[PDB]
Amino acid sequence: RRXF
Amino acid sequence: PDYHEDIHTYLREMEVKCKPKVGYMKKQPDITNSMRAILVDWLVEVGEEYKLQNETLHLAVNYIDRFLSSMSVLRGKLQLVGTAAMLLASKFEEIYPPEVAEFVYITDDTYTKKQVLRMEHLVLKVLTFDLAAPTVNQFLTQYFLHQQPANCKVESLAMFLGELSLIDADPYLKYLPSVIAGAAFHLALYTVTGQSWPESLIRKTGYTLESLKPCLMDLHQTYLKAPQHAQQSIREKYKNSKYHGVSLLNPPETLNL
Amino acid sequence: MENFQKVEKIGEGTYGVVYKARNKLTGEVVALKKIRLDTETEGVPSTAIREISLLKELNHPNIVKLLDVIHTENKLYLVFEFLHQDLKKFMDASALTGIPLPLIKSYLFQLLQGLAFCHSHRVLHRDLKPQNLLINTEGAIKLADFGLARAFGVPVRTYTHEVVTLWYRAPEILLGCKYYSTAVDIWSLGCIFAEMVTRRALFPGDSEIDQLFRIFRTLGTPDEVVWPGVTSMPDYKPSFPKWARQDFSKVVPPLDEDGRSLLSQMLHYDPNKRISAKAALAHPFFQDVTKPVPH
Numbered sequence: 276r277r278x279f
Numbered sequence: 280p281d282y283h284e285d286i287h288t289y290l291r292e293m294e295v296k297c298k299p300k301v302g303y304m305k306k307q308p309d310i311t312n313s314m315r316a317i318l319v320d321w322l323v324e325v326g327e328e329y330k331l332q333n334e335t336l337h338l339a340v341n342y343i344d345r346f347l348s349s350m351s352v353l354r355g356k357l358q359l360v361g362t363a364a365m366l367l368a369s370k371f372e373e374i375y376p377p378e379v380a381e382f383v384y385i386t387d388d389t390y391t392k393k394q395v396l397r398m399e400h401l402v403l404k405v406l407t408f409d410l411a412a413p414t415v416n417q418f419l420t421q422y423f424l425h426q427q428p429a430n431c432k433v434e435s436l437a438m439f440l441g442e443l444s445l446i447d448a449d450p451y452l453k454y455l456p457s458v459i460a461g462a463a464f465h466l467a468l469y470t471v472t473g474q475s476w477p478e479s480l481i482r483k484t485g486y487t488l489e490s491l492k493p494c495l496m497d498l499h500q501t502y503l504k505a506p507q508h509a510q511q512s513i514r515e516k517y518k519n520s521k522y523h524g525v526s527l528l529n530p531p532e533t534l535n536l
Numbered sequence: 537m538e539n540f541q542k543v544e545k546i547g548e549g550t551y552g553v554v555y556k557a558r559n560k561l562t563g564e565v566v567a568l569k570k571i572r573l574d575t576e577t578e579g580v581p582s583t584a585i586r587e588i589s590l591l592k593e594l595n596h597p598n599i600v601k602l603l604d605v606i607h608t609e610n611k612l613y614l615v616f617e618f619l620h621q622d623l624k625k626f627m628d629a630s631a632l633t634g635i636p637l638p639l640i641k642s643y644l645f646q647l648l649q650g651l652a653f654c655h656s657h658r659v660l661h662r663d664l665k666p667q668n669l670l671i672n673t674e675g676a677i678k679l680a681d682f683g684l685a686r687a688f689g690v691p692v693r694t695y696t697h698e699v700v701t702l703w704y705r706a707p708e709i710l711l712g713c714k715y716y717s718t719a720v721d722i723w724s725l726g727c728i729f730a731e732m733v734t735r736r737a738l739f740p741g742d743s744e745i746d747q748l749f750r751i752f753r754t755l756g757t758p759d760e761v762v763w764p765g766v767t768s769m770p771d772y773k774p775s776f777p778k779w780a781r782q783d784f785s786k787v788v789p790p791l792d793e794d795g796r797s798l799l800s801q802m803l804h805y806d807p808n809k810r811i812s813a814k815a816a817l818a819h820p821f822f823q824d825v826t827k828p829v830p831h
Contacts, residue, residue, distance in 0.1 A: 276321075276385075276386075276387055277386060277387045277389040278318070278321065278357070278358040278386075278389070279314050279317065279354040279355070279357060279358070
């Protein structure tokens with residue numbers, strides 16, 4: 276996964 | 280071992296040179312503790328996913344904090360610094376590390392392979408190649424040799440508490456790893472058996488139960504709040520029978536200090 | 537890099553071609569090692585990660601000095617102090633006459649001082665052999681090539697399929713133990729010590745299994761009295777021939793009682809009783825050590  | 284004392288002394292010398300800045304997060308204009316906690320939590324999953332050693336995880340967290348201690352990093356690049364750190368850590372500690380492609384894969388192609396390779400290079404410049412950092416995991420290993428008898432619920436649970444401390448930079452950034460490890464061992468020992476920080480270890484570390492108190496207080500709070508925390512990767516991990524399920528054990532309600 | 541001039545290739549190694557080079561401004565002579573930063577592969581290899589970070593903590597007259605590390609876009613250069621040859625080449629150029637005994641004794645003394653310094657700094661060398669020991673013309677010898685060296689702040693897990701040259705491998709590694717200990721460096725060194733004395737590899741085996749039997753033929757098959765736990769070991773087989781310890785004076789003829797006393801303690805089967813590098817430096821064998829120069 277990407278995250279922010 | 281004839282060097283086992285020398286190592287301990289030498290590890291205590293090295294932990295002071297590998298210390299990150301105390302309040303680095305607040306001169307960091309775009310990121311925070313809360314997003315550092317999401318990163319580290321993510322790193323625990325990546326370790327589980329690739330069956331990495333616990334040490335690789337402690338190492339990567341040390342690199343990240345030391346790096347963020349002198350470089351401003353935008354939120355969209357935070358994961359890149361973390362993913363480069365986990366690569367270096369694996370290269371340093373793992374027998375065979377995962378390929379860069381796999382590190383690119385876990386991000387969901389959010390960065391390119393070259394971007395990772397250039398970050399690795401950047402992290403190496405900033406840390407000046409100083410990769411051999413002492414970790415809470417290391418001192419725990421040294422402390423375990425002073426237990427009678429060997430009680431592996433205490434070992435698992437002390438590991439577990441030491442991993443939790445990786446997640447929150449406030450407060451754990453202001454303790455040395457030898458102190459957090461002491462605090463974790465006492466707490467785990469106290470919890471399973473009602474026992475206390477042994478005399479053997481006071482003699483070894485020169486750390487009274489009393490000088491552990493500030494850090495032991497924090498770790499008690501953390502332990503008590505653990506089922507409530509935004510991040511849950513570590514509890515997930517320590518439910519495994521491989522860790523005798525210590526994540527499920529009930530924290531004691533008072534320390535009795 | 538602009539301040540270095542290459543003089544000649546001085547052989548190949550872990551990270552490829554090694555050059556002798558000279559600093560154009562100070563006059564200093566230096567061995568350059570070049571890593572090619574292939575931006576398509578794996579980045580900096582783990583051999584460089586380990587050698588750089590470990591060698592930077594290790595400062596000792598018997599460990600090669602890492603002088604500098606040079607970074608560019610596409611290249612990483614390592615800059616080491618220059619030593620003109622290794623033990624292996626010295627031993628082939630010394631075959632026939634042999635290496636004089638006072639020089640063996642001096643070299644072993646120096647090597648144990650470097651090893652003691654590594655081990656007390658939580659560093660395992662992991663790959664000691666005549667090729668990885670370098671000498672100058674004044675009679676120094678130095679541990680080199682830290683590409684496999686490991687920090688053992690946490691015990692180091694062994695390779696399932698050892699990559700490292702059969703002949704200097706400790707018995708516990710061959711029987712498939714779970715972790716290395718400092719003991720594995722001592723065993724290598726005991727082997728090198730015998731090789732300098734006899735002019736020949738102590739245990740020249742062909743396969744993991746033949747390596748073990750060559751050790752058992754010279755030292756005798758170990759049993760639970762000698763080595764508490766051998767029979768519990770992963771690669772241990774009850775069908776191992778039961779050879780009886782052969783006579784130590786016939787293994788290393790040219791060595792006095794103190795030589796054989798030390799050498800046999802460096803070859804104890806049990807990693808727990810093998811003499812450490814620190815205790816070996818107090819051995820009576822080194823009571824008359826001096827510092828001769830090689831020819």
